Design a binder for this molecule. Structure first.
Ligand SMILES: Nc1nccc(-c2ccccc2)n1
Ligand SMILES: Nc1nccc(-c2ccccc2)n1
Length: 158
């Protein structure tokens, strides 16, 4: 039948030549994992404005200019609504990251990407992000650890 309805999310990676900024989620769904900064797009908000807003709210960083790098759809067994995540990256920042109620930030060298403490799907698409290759992906999860199905492709245009 019809593909499930999806909720629009953004996800932002601050990716510099030698390091990436990640936030450890302090509470809720996915708590205890390092990831990018993101959340739900609000009514009337452009996707990129939502991405900038999520970065500011969760990390304190203000950036003008994000680059679209990928789209990932997440599905969780037992929940009919999908997560439609638009992924962005920026290399140029001009402030300091701060701990927020949602996220605790640390910088990671790019030979120390903390995959063991990141969502399992990141092992597949994060390498494409690091190579500056655009991608579309889909991951079906049983709970937070187990992938039952996934698709992934490199694209020329997101
Ligand atoms: N906590 C939780 N657990 C399972 C699924 C979801 C979900 C959220 C937004 C959109 C689609 C699914 N959220
Ligand atoms: N990379 C990835 N994979 C699956 C789910 C998530 C997620 C993280 C925080 C909040 C909601 C979903 N992130």
């Amino acid at each position: 039948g019809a593909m499930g309805a999806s909720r629009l999310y953004t996800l932002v990676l601050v990716l510099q030549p030698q390091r990436v900024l990640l936030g450890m989620k302090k509470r809720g769904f996915g708590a205890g994992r390092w990831g990018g900064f993101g959340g739900k797009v609000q009514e009337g908000e452009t996707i990129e404005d939502g991405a900038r807003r999520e970065l500011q709210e969760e990390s304190g960083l203000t950036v003008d200019a994000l680059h679209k790098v990928g789209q990932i759809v997440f599905e969780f067994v037992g929940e009919p609504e999908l997560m439609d995540v638009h992924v962005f990256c920026t290399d140029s920042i001009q402030g300091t990251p701060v701990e927020s109620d949602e996220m605790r930030p640390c910088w990671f060298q790019l030979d120390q990407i903390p995959f063991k403490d990141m969502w399992p799907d990141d092992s597949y698409w994060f390498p494409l992000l690091l190579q500056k290759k655009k991608f579309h992906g889909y991951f079906k999860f049983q709970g937070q650890d187990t992938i039952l199905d996934y698709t992934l492709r490199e694209v020329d245009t997101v």
